[PDB]
């Protein structure tokens, strides 16, 4: 997928990497029951702690530029570097959001709640007032500052449907601009999920651990490359994405 | 039920506890008739005074840690304490608002008028302009500063119905925020009553006597607990709720 | 009737009492009719002056509190005094507004114009734009600062009917609050008249002469009261209401 | 008719009286017709000048005040004087506007255009947008600053019909206040004409020539009045009204 | 026709008169066509020039004043002069706008485009949004500052139809005032054309060449006039109107 | 076509002409793919560079002026020059926008995306919200400052359809004025394309290379022209238009 | 009854009164025990505690004395007060012991065991050695210090029967003196019960709560009393008697 890096910006970042990142989170809950008198029927059950590991898989790829074109056009190298970096940053976006990446990178799907929902097409085909009740459910211990993810098409369709004006979203504004749903900002990214927003904010949904990003490496010294000058400029993806629970 | 402690905040608090709280209120009213001339057929009565008692039931329910995990992870204890307290403070809410609690706590229902209304599902399924007439009726003897209790779903549905804008309540605002009905603030708590608001304000509706709240107690010294280090951390619910009349 | 003393507040007050109040007002009008030149046939008479008298009759109704409960609860006396005074101030309201009082108070009806209108139910059952024409008629010789009297039910119905918003009166506000009709404030009192407002302002409509109000008297010394301590606390109403003409 | 002197205020005033007022106005107009070359058949016509006379009829009608009441109540004289003056100033209004006066004063009717329209009840019963076209017609040779005369009832009905708000006139205001029709101020006087406003402004419509107004005269010296002290206080109307043309 | 001189004010004026005005304008246009290569079949054409003549007609007509009335009333002469001038200035308006004139003056019709449209009644009876597209078509070469001519009736009807308010034109204002259509000012003149506005602005539509206007001439010296003093005051119309093309 | 030169103004201009203009742009892009480990299946590619050529052909055509009219009217020559220049600048517009030109100039069609769309009539006949999604799609890599091209008819129809007011475009304004669509300015040119706007801004869509424009040449010296004085003034078009890709 | 207050003296006295006397006594109890090694157990048992209610009723009997005798004899008042106080203290004795009271006092009967024995005349007519075995039955659990109640007649009869001497009781003493049965003191009160003594001592048999005793009130201010001086002095009994069980 190729667009603006919008999900990563709101996505929580963690380093802690020697080779890779390590984080510790809680699971489960301590619950209660009893009555008046002495004695009572009473039972136990404590919380649990997890330590999860997050690996980074490389999504490389090469580009073989000849010495003749490299010497004839000096600009064609800098344009190649400037393009290949965005192309794989968007390849990272595919992993960061929820898509399929042509380069062999991490392939996960939609932002999870406290649960990983199964990817399924909805019988009713509309995104509407369900975005109002979600960060509203996000008001128990649940902290707001959410982000309802919607596709530019549904954002144009939501602009098409009845709002304050005949145009505009929940905030009366054109699509893919300063996007905003009810009581919080909206994220407009193409080719994504068309369903009710997941429970829990940034911290619960998506986390991005980064060692680095796609690094370029050109090697003029390869058995066939050195004589021709047909040097191989190589993008090499780094930094991973995680879709957390609890 | 698990949500924000919204009803208790507006709910009136009383201490006076040696072991438990004691309060005195009046019942009924004295009224008499007369005519012009002499003599008249005049009969008159008295007002009665009541002294009601409020007991606190315990909603315990332990949780069994293990020495190994307690030593391996130091954080698992403080997190357990901090989550079990919310778990039973929300269990108190279930009693405070009107719900069923898994722990054997005080199980009452809806906020009463000068009368306890029978819990029944309405034939017309809508919460609307009835919130106008209630604190309006709350103007004869009655002081306002009321609190119309509405479910997040009906508050989203009331946002859906015709108001000032296409969304927003009686005060044009997204649900589960700074909620407000006509002339006074609204309370948004999930899984509650869907009917006309009760007569009489906070003082008449709900009162909450508190000795304390859910207190934690860990005992490493039990037969199976001391050798294994499998200590039992125990939530113990305290403080009660009342739904007053007159 | 029982509510807030709203009509008495706007109602004009007169003392002048030795035993009772005395006021002097004018009746009738002088007129003319002539032609040109001489001689003419022209004749008319004088204006008249009245001196009306307003008496006050006691609205009684005892309450016999026992010495035992008096010594048991010291509060039950002050609560009785603070309840019986409101009970008869509202009994006065019934006379002041237009209702039927249980106690022996002066029973009159609706606020009069320059005429006493006969109490009759309207064939058209609505209170609406008729409040616009009335103090409008009170703009010739007459002065405004009127008070259209409406029942909370019709005020909720007037809120229900088409206005600036979907709710609100002639001034967009919930009923039984700071009530206001067109170009002047509204009075919301339950169980009153449902018709066009009377001509003439406060001075012409209702006047309230007061010596005092309901005075409490407890006598422990009665042949059966001194023994049991079953003291009889008796509310006795004072101050009268008049519905004036011209 | 009895109301505020509203028509006289806008009505043009003329004195010039030795015994009565005299004014000179023009009648008719001169026109022209001809074609090219010579010689042509062309006819002639002159303008005419008129000198009209305006007489003032009286409006007497005594009030026989007894010496006993005059001495017992000193106030009854000043009240009589201050009331009989208004009673006949309103009688002048009846003549000034268009009404039948119980006094044998000047009895004329509706404000004329450049023509005196016959008093007839309209088949369509409404006063509406016709008040827009009238001083709009008064924009050619004519000057604005008009006054559409409407009855309080129709002005409440015009408030009842579709305007800017659900209430208010062409200017959104309650009737009998600071009344205003389209582009100019409205006059609200009861019991008047319900038709399209006349052509021509104040100068063309109504003129009020005044020597004086209703003058009071009391004579204690009449054959029966001197002995009884039954003196006759007598109003005497003065100043006339005219409804002009051209 | 008799109204305010509104069309002449915006109408362009030309003098240049020795006896009458002379102006030079262009007709037709020269175009070009070709093909790729050599040689090509290419035809040629010229632009033409015209010198048009505009004559002035005399719309006279006399007014016969008797010596007796001339001496009895001195004001009748100045009034006659002051009326007859407006009478024939409005007679000129009939020619200037598009009407029939009693005094045989120049009788032309509606403002022309680059073409003289045939005077015909429209099948659809409405003047509306077509006034928007006309000076919008006047945006290619065409400079705006146009003048959509509409009848006071259609202006009141256009006020009646749906606009910003329930009244007012394309600019929300009452008829025959500071009239304005879309983008530019409107002209309100009675008894004129009810159709789409002509193409081209003031310079293309109407031009008014003026030597003078209606000149008054009184001759006491006529064979029957000298003895009677029955002198003949005579309006004599001057200055003509033209409805141009190209 | 004949209108205002609106597309050329926003259209990007390039000189660089010796005889004609030369520009260099890049085609295609170089991508990447691979996985973790060693070794991996990995392929390479290159970006291509183009050097396109843009010629200019003359859209000529003559105009024959006779010596007699040239001497009789001096103005007819300057008028001919002033008309024929606009005639062929509008003929250039036909090429610059997308039309058919009478003189054989360069005939191309609609503004291209990164692709040349086939000229076809739409099954749904409307231009609406699709103008919002286009420079919205141009918010990723693409820069805004776009120009949605619409026909005055569809601009009047877009004014006719539901907007902020009953009239006006996406910006509430009349057609053929200061035209503006959503988030950017609109171009109103007659007889153009009725479809979704092309991807890419000015630089990607249309480029106009100019050596000059239509140059006039008059030759009095031709075998038949010299004796008659029937000189031939001939428009000869210059400067070309290109509809770019990538 | 009328004699010496003997039963009340030995009877246990309590207060605790607000208006009523409230005492707390145990109706038995249940307790348990636990063990160690490990291994703690919970104790089971509900404390059987009662809280009983006792109300005091007034015994009355007015006596009216004239002003003349009050002034003639000053001593008659102090004698009356001294006579009436003993009269009702002996009337209280009737309630305290077991008799019938002429005044409206609490009417109970014989001292109960752990049971209320039915008042019945014995077939054998004698009171003898049964008084020995009764506090001897009160030697297992029970503590002595008892009081065998006997009538002066049976005391004289018990003196008459075989003892140490020919006269004297179980302790050789004449009737109505320092009375004593076997092991413990006797009580001589006339008109009481002739049967075996009840089980349980003072605490189990009778308890005497006292708010006060018979209070005297004289009111010279009664409608018939003030003029005559025939003041009414009325005894009003206070303080009740309880006959306990368990």
UniProtKB/Swiss-Prot annotation, chains A, B, C, D, E, F, G:
Q: Where in the cell is it found?
A: Virion
A biological process term (GO) from this entry: viral translational frameshifting
Q: Does the keyword Nucleus apply?
A: no
Major location (coarse): virion
| Keywords per UniProt | Capsid protein, Virion
One GO location term (cellular component): viral capsid
Keyword Chaperone present in the record's keywords: the answer is: no
Specify where the region named Intercapsomeric interactions lies, as residue ranges: 53-57
One of the record's GO molecular function terms:
identical protein binding
Q: Which family does it belong to?
A: Belongs to the T7virus major capsid protein family.
The record comments on the domains as follows:
The N-terminus interacts with an internal region of the major capsid protein subunit in an adjacent capsomere (intercapsomeric interactions) to stabilize the capsid.
Function description = Assembles with the minor capsid protein to form an icosahedral capsid with a T=7 symmetry, about 60 nm in diameter, and consisting of 415 capsid proteins. The major and minor capsid proteins are incorporated into the capsid in about a 90/10 ratio respectively. Once the capsid is formed, encapsidates one single copy of the viral genome.
Quaternary structure (record):
Homohexamer. Interacts with the connector protein and the minor capsid protein. Interacts with the capsid assembly scaffolding protein; capsid proteins and scaffolding proteins form building blocks that assemble to form the procapsid, each hexamer of the major capsid protein interacting with 2 scaffolding proteins.
**Protein name, entry field:** Major capsid protein
What is the covered span of the full protein? 100 to 345 of 345
């Amino acid at each position: 997928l190729t667009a603006d890096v919008l999900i990563y910006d709101i996505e929580d970042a963690m380093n802690h990497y020697d080779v890779r990142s390590e984080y510790t989170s809680q699971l489960g809950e301590s619950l209660a029951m009893a009555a008046d008198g002495a004695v009572l029927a009473e039972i136990a059950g404590l919380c649990n702690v997890e330590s999860k590991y997050n690996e980074n898989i490389e999504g490389l790829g090469t580009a073989t530029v000849i010495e003749t074109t490299q010497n004839k056009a000096a600009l064609t190298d800098q344009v190649a570097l400037g393009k290949e970096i965005i192309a794989a940053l968007t390849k990272a976006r595919a992993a960061l959001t929820k898509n399929y990446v042509p380069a062999a990178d991490r392939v996960f799907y939609c932002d999870p709640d406290s649960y990983s929902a199964i990817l399924a097409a909805l019988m009713p085909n509309a995104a509407n007032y369900a975005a109002l009740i979600d960060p509203e459910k996000g008001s128990i211990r649940n902290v707001m500052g959410f982000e309802v993810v919607e596709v530019p098409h549904l954002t144009a369709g939501g602009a098409g449907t009845a709002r304050e004006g005949t145009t505009g979203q929940k905030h009366v504004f054109p699509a893919n601009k300063g996007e905003g749903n009810v009581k919080v900002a909206k994220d407009n990214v193409i080719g994504l999920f068309m369903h009710r927003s997941a429970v829990g904010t940034v911290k619960l949904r998506d986390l991005a651990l980064e060692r680095a990003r796609r690094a370029n490496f050109q090697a003029d010294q390869i058995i066939a490359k050195y004589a021709m000058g047909h040097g191989g400029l190589r993008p090499e993806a780094a930094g991973a994405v995680v879709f957390k629970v609890e």
